[PDB]
Amino acid sequence: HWGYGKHNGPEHWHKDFPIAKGERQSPVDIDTHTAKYDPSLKPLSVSYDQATSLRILNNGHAFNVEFDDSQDKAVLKGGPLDGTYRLIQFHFHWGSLDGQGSEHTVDKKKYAAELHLVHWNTKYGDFGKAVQQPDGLAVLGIFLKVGSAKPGLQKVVDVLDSIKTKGKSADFTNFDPRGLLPESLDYWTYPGSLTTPPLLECVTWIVLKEPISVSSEQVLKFRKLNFNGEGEPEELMVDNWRPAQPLKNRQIKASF
Numbered sequence: 001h002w003g004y005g006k007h008n009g010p011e012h013w014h015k016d017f018p019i020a021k022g023e024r025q026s027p028v029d030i031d032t033h034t035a036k037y038d039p040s041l042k043p044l045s046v047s048y049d050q051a052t053s054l055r056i057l058n059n060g061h062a063f064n065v066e067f068d069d070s071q072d073k074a075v076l077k078g079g080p081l082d083g084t085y086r087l088i089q090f091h092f093h094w095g096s097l098d099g100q101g102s103e104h105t106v107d108k109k110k111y112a113a114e115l116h117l118v119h120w121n122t123k124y125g126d127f128g129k130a131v132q133q134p135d136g137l138a139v140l141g142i143f144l145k146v147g148s149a150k151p152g153l154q155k156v157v158d159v160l161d162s163i164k165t166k167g168k169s170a171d172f173t174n175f176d177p178r179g180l181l182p183e184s185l186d187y188w189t190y191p192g193s194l195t196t197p198p199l200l201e202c203v204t205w206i207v208l209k210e211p212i213s214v215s216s217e218q219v220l221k222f223r224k225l226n227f228n229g230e231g232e233p234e235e236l237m238v239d240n241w242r243p244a245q246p247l248k249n250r251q252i253k254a255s256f
C-alpha cells in the first residue's frame with residue numbers, strides 16, 4: 001500500500017488515487033516573483049490559546065499530534081478563509097538530510113521540514129463531511145530551517161521514543177501549539193490538495209512566509225522514527241514528502 005519508497009512512493013500514487021494527476025494538486029513551487037500581491041486578503045486569525053492536545057501517534061507515514069476538535073478550541077479564521085476552521089492535528093514532513101524535507105518550495109528552495117496544521121471548515125459539521133468539499137480544509141504550512149532550537153518543539157521531540165514504530169501512541173495533553181508559530185503571519189495562499197493519499201482537492205493552503213528554526217539535534221530525533229511496525233524490519237522514517245506538482249492555471253496570492 002502507499003508509502004514513500006521506490007516501489008510505492010509518489011510516482012506510483014496515481015494508480016490507486018487517479019486524482020494525483022488532477023488540476024489542483026499540492027505541494028507546488030511558490031515562485032515569489034509571479035505571486036500576485038492581493039490587497040483584499042484580510043490578516044490571519046490564529047486562536048490557539050484554548051487548544052487541547054490529546055495524543056501523539058506514529059501512523060506509518062508521520063507522527064500526528066491530535067487535538068480535541070469537539071468545540072471551537074483552536075481555530076483559524078481570516079486570511080483567504082470564509083468561516084471558522086478548527087484544528088484537528090498537526091504533523092511534519094522531513095528529509096534524510098537538512099537540504100530537503102519540505103513539500104512546498106519557495107523559488108525552488110527546499111527546507112529541512114514542513115509543519116502542517118490541519119483545520120476543517122466548521123460549517124460542514126465534522127471532518128468527514130469537510131473532506132467532501134472544495135473549501136473543506138485549510139492547512140497552515142510552516143517551513144522549518146536548521147539553526148537554533150525552537151523551545152516549544154522540544155516536548156514533541158522528547159516523546160518520540162515512546163512512539164518509535166507504526167501504530168504506537170502516547171498521551172500528549174497540555175501541549176500548546178502557539179510555540180511553533182513564527183513571529184510574522186505574512187503568507188501565500190492558493191487552492192490545493194492533501195499531499196498524501198487520498199490527495200483530495202479539499203484544501204486552501206496558507207503557507208507562511210517566515211520559517212521557524214530548529215536545531216539539528218531536534219530534527220535528528222525526527223529521523224529515528226520508523227515507518228515499520230515493531231517486529232518488522234526497520235525502515236527509518238525519512239523523506240516522507242511529495243515533490244511539487246504543476247500549478248496548472250492557479251495563481252498564488254501573497255498577503256504582502
Ligand SMILES: COc1ccc(N2C[C@H](O)c3cc(S(N)(=O)=O)sc3S2(=O)=O)cc1
Pocket residue numbers: 116118128131139193194195196197198
Ligand atoms: C477518510 O477521511 C480522511 C481524509 C483525509 C485524512 N488525512 C490524512 C492524510 O494523511 C493527510 C495529509 C495531509 S497534508 N500533508 O497536510 O496535506 S492532511 C491529511 S488528513 O488528516 O486530512 C484522514 C482521513
Ligand SMILES: [Hg+2]
Pocket residue numbers: 131132133134135136200201202203
Ligand atoms: Hg474536496
Ligand SMILES: [Zn+2]
Pocket residue numbers: 091092093116195
Ligand atoms: Zn502534511
